[PDB]
Amino acid sequence: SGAIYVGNYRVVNRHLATHNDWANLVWEDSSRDLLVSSTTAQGCDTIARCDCQTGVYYCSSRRKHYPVSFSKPSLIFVEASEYYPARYQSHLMLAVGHSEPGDCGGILRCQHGVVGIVSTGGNGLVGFADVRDLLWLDE
Ligand SMILES: NC(=O)[C@H]1CCCN(C(=O)Cc2ccnc(Cl)c2Br)C1
Numbered sequence: 611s612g613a614i615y616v617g618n619y620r621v622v623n624r625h626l627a628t629h630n631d632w633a634n635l636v637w638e639d640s641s642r643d644l645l646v647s648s649t650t651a652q653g654c655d656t657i658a659r660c661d662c663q664t665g666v667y668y669c670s671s672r673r674k675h676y677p678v679s680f681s682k683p684s685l686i687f688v689e690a691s692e693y694y695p696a697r698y699q700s701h702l703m704l705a706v707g708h709s710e711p712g713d714c715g716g717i718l719r720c721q722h723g724v725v726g727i728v729s730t731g732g733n734g735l736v737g738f739a740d741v742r743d744l745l746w747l748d749e
């Protein structure tokens with residue numbers, strides 16, 4: 611589980627979005643596995659605006675933060691699940707590391723701020739949905 615709270619926005623994985631997220635929907639993209647909903651309370655997480663290829667992500671299934679090198683966001687094939695058919699997920703960044711289904715929504719950060727959130731996993735590779743191109747989040 612896990613979300614980013616920046617201004618009056620809540621950024622979550624779309625396959626994990628709640629009834630309230632959909633009743634307060636702002637933007638959603640099935641190919642990115644992202645949904646942004648509106649909040650009443652203000653948030654103050656900082657989104658990173660950079661092209662860093664190193665960072666640290668929280669892995670709940672180990673209660674640990676791991677430093678990883680990850681790929682630039684791109685079109686990556688994803689196996690069929692109970693949420694999506696077989697497809698290409700865009701804006702996915704991959705790193706070699708541990709993840710379990712429950713680790714989805716864990717945040718990946720660099721010295722500037724939030725890079726993105728855990729969205730895909732398995733085979734010793736953890737995938738992160740990038741959020742740095744979504745400039746509208748900061749206003
Ligand atoms: N973005 C998707 O299509 C995911 C929907 C849920 C299923 N999915 C996975 O990759 C499952 C998974 C396995 C091991 N570690 C992690 Cl962090 C995950 Br998430 C694919």
Ligand SMILES: [Zn+2]
Nearest residue numbers: 660662720722
């Ligand atoms: Zn950075």
